[PDB]
Design a protein around this ligand. Structure first.
Ligand SMILES: CO[C@H]1O[C@H](CO)[C@@H](O)[C@H](O[C@H]2O[C@H](CO)[C@@H](O)[C@H](O)[C@@H]2O)[C@@H]1O
Lengths: 14, 279
């Protein structure tokens, strides 16, 4: 790939 | 006749060789991409200019090394362009002063992709240049060999276009939510530009990227990219129209998207590739 995207996220208990 | 580098390394009368460590700032140009300008790095002078005229060429065999050896391009010698690697000696540049003047050499690479790149590690060889010095005095014929090394890590563009960044990390708001992806592209001259995403998908539509977080992963969610509300799936070319010298945003936003089953607490991560094409 010409570019590499890294998507970080989180599911928090509620 | 002798030469020296910007850091003072020198090759004396009669020639020899030296290593040249340069900080690179590659850039796409119209039709050719700048790899490295050496007119700030290598300097030469005539030792008896009242009596002797010195002649300097770039000798055939001069070429890229390291990972760049596969690529062809051009060399700009005292303003004019010649093929590179040099298969025939260039014209002659006169040296007629004791003052050190630049050896006016700049190396370029012929685009072979749309917005591709090739990584240069600091300390690796990028070129070997052969300076040939003669005169109008005797039959001196001397070789000054310059081994050009990268002094820093860079990416040399191999295409007509370049990107705001090669590695982008974004952080979503805690689920649910979305975040824009800052990613732009421009081209040296106008090009009909598209792109396509690549990655591991969890759905039939190939539109949700799998959660590959390895420590304490959440469940039942993936990552999905939108372009102002339009879902962008993998391996589908998206057209950007005509892209020129003004940067164009790809318009991308990251979202969480349900993949099936109970959504559980934990981490979410997706790695997504972007690859540009011409249309
Ligand atoms: C008066 O210069 C002649 O005598 C000097 C001493 O022997 C030489 O160094 C000189 O040759 C070097 O300088 C000239 C002028 O730059 C150059 O043409 C030659 O190739 C040597 O570098 C010259 O012979």
């Amino acid at each position: 790939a010409d570019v590499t995207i890294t998507v970080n996220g989180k599911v928090v208990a509620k | 006749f002798a030469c020296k580098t910007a850091n003072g390394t020198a090759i004396p009368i009669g020639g020899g060789s030296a290593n040249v460590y340069v900080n690179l700032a590659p850039a796409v140009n119209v039709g050719q991409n700048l790899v490295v300008d050496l007119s700030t790095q290598i300097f030469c002078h005539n030792d008896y200019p009242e009596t002797i005229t010195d002649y300097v060429t770039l000798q055939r065999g001069s070429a890229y090394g390291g990972v760049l050896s596969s690529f062809s391009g051009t060399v700009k010698y005292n303003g004019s362009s010649y093929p590179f690697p040099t298969t025939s000696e260039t014209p002659r540049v006169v040296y007629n002063s004791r003052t050190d003047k630049p050896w006016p050499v700049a190396l370029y690479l012929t685009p072979v992709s749309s917005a591709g790149g090739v990584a240069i590690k600091a300390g690796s060889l990028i070129a070997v240049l052969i300076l040939r010095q003669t005169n109008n005095y005797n039959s001196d014929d001397f070789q000054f060999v310059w081994n050009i090394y990268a002094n820093n890590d860079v990416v040399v563009p191999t295409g007509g276009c370049d990107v705001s960044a090669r590695d982008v990390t974004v952080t979503l708001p805690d689920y649910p939510g979305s975040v824009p992806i800052p990613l732009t592209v421009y081209c040296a001259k106008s090009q009909n530009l598209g792109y396509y995403l690549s990655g591991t998908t969890a759905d039939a539509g190939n539109s949700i990227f799998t959660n590959t977080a390895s420590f304490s992963p959440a469940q039942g969610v993936g990552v999905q990219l939108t372009r102002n509300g339009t879902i962008i799936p993998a391996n589908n070319t998206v057209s950007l129209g005509a892209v020129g010298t003004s940067a164009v945003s790809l318009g991308l936003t990251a979202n969480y998207a349900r993949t099936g089953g109970q959504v559980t607490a934990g981490n979410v991560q997706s790695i997504i590739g972007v690859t540009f094409v011409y249309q």
